[PDB]
Amino acid sequence: MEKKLSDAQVALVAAWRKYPDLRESLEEAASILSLIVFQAETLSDQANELANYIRRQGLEEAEGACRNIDIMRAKWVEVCGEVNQHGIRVYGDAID
Amino acid sequence: MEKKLSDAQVALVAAWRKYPDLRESLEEAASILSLIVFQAETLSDQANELANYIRRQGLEEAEGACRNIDIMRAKWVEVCGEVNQHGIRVYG
Ligand SMILES: [Br-]
Ligand SMILES: [Br-]
Ligand SMILES: [Br-]
Ligand SMILES: [Br-]
């Protein structure tokens, strides 16, 4: 349960497997987690694209912020992984 | 549930209320969710700043991207709320 998105999803499934009365509750909760992750990944992609633009234009004044974004995105993938081309969220060295 | 970060957090708490053995489990889960909300808001703020820079430079090429960041930030606040000046996450 080492701080990965997969652990939190797994723990919620486990609970409504032990106690089926929790299923509606905790499934709406997993749905919200999923929506939160989705929205974050949408904005993150937009920010990355904006950073690509700033670099392509040789706009060096904003380079620090563009680096920050890289680090933040890299930190995100450590916790949440990355959805591959087949639409499956994968982690670690299963990414490359 | 109204599909808000707060509604989801409660469902997690409520569950280990009915069933205390779930507590280590679901609270670790809540920890991960909070970390996720935190990391997303850190990046979001940074992105907003980048858009601010681009708007102070009058660069109309990237303006669509800036309007996009604004739209998705407003949507974020719909689900996750927003921390007011007193350190309390509030919704609307
Ligand atoms: Br939270
Ligand atoms: Br962090
Ligand atoms: Br600026
Ligand atoms: Br509120």
Numbering used by the authors:
A (entry chain A): 1 to 96
B (entry chain B): 1 to 92
Give excerpts from the publication:
One mechanism by which phages and other mobile genetic elements are able to overcome the CRISPR-Cas system is through the expression of anti-CRISPR proteins. We previously reported that gene 34 from Pseudomonas phage JBD5, which encodes the protein AcrE1, shows anti-CRISPR activity against the type I-E system of P. aeruginosa strain SMC4386 (4). We show that AcrE1 binds to the CRISPR-associated helicase/nuclease Cas3 and that the C-terminal region of the anti-CRISPR protein is important for its inhibitory activity. In summary, these experiments demonstrate that AcrE1 functions by blocking the activity of Cas3 without inhibiting the DNA-binding activity of Cascade.
Here, we report the 2.5-Å-resolution crystal structure of anti-CRISPR protein AcrE1, which inhibits the type I-E CRISPR-Cas system of P. aeruginosa. (a) Crystal structure of the C-terminal 6×His-tagged AcrE1 solved by Br-SAD reveals a predominantly helical dimeric protein. AcrE1 displays an elongated dimeric structure. Each monomer is predominantly comprised of three helices. Helix 1 (residues 5 to 17) is followed by a tight turn leading into the very long helix 2 (residues 21 to 57). A short turn at the end of helix 2 leads into helix 3 (residues 62 to 80), which terminates close enough to the beginning of helix 1 for a potential H-bond to form between the carbonyl O of Val79 and the amide N of Leu5. Residues 82 to 90 form an antiparallel β-sheet that protrudes at a 90° angle from the end of helix 3. The final 10 residues of AcrE1 are likely disordered, as they were not well defined in the electron density map and could not be modeled into the structure. The large dimeric interface is composed primarily of 18 hydrophobic residues from each monomer that are greater than 97% buried, forming a single hydrophobic core that spans the entire length of the helices. The structure of AcrE1 is not similar to other previously determined anti-CRISPR proteins, and searches using the Dali server did not reveal structural similarity to any other protein.
